Amino acid sequence: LAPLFGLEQDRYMTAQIFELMGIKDTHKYLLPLEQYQPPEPSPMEILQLEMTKAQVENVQASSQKMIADAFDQRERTTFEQQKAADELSLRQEELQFKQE
Amino acid sequence: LAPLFGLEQDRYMTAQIFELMGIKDTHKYLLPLEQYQPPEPSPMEILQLEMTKAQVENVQASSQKMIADAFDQRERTTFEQQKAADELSLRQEELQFKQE
Amino acid sequence: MTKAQVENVQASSQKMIADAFDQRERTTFEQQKAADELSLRQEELQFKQE
């Protein structure tokens, strides 16, 4: 039932209790909800959110670096096959030279 | 209800209690809110915020270094393809030499 | 100690970009060497044709 028992309902309950016991409730710290501005968040949760964001971003960066190095190895194997083909062509050229 | 039960309301409540029991409240440590300056934050939370900022900045630095090395590997593969093309051109040059 | 730790954190953060720029300069130097090798290839072609 807390999702419905917001702030204004609790304030009205406490105010009714006071009226039953002490009438003037505005005389002190307690403020009429009409002029109660919301609290100003602190830098702690802000920097905590920033740290969590940086951590998840580093996680995604590592995840992408994995596939990056995978593609790098694939391209390196392709280049090695290319070098093998070039060496075969050079072998054929040397055969032509020897036969001439 | 705490967001409305600020400092001044609590001070008024305590002052009313005192008046009911002890009249002169200003005689001692308790100060009239009019001349109560806010507390001076300590270096502890400051250095903690600084450490959190440095940590998140290092996280972002690693995240960027990931893509940096990825682009480096991509450029290296491109350079390898360039070297393969150069070797093919040199093979054609050697073929021209042998045929001449 | 807290100051030294945060300073080391900033030092690592800067070293990251430092090594990044180093790799960039190394790739640039590799492209330069490739251009030099192409020029030497053209020189060898001139030699062979002469």
Numbering used by the authors:
A (entry chain J), B (entry chain K): 549 to 648
C (entry chain J): 599 to 648
Authors' text:
Here we show that the virion of SU10 has a prolate head, containing genome and ejection proteins, and a tail, which is formed of portal, adaptor, nozzle, and tail needle proteins and decorated with long and short fibers. In contrast to other short-tailed phages, the tails of Kuraviruses elongate upon cell attachment. After binding to the host, SU10 tail, nozzle proteins, and short fibers re-arrange to form a nozzle that extends the tail.
The tail is attached to one of the vertices of the prolate capsid, where the dodecamer of portal proteins (gp6) replaces a pentamer of capsid proteins. Furthermore, the wing domain mediates the interactions of the portal complex with the capsid. Because of the mismatch of the fivefold symmetry of the capsid and twelvefold symmetry of the portal, we characterized their interactions using an asymmetric reconstruction of the neck region of the SU10 virion, which reached a resolution of 4.6 Å. Residues 8–44 from the wing domain form a curved α-helix that lines the inner face of the capsid. Additional interactions between the portal and capsid are mediated by the wing domain’s stem loop. The stem domain connects the wing and clip domains and spans across the capsid shell. The clip domain of the portal complex reaches out from the capsid and enables the attachment of the adaptor proteins. An embracing loop of adaptor protein is wedged between the clip domains of a pair of neighboring portal proteins and binds to stem loops of two additional portal proteins positioned clockwise when looking at the portal complex from outside the capsid.
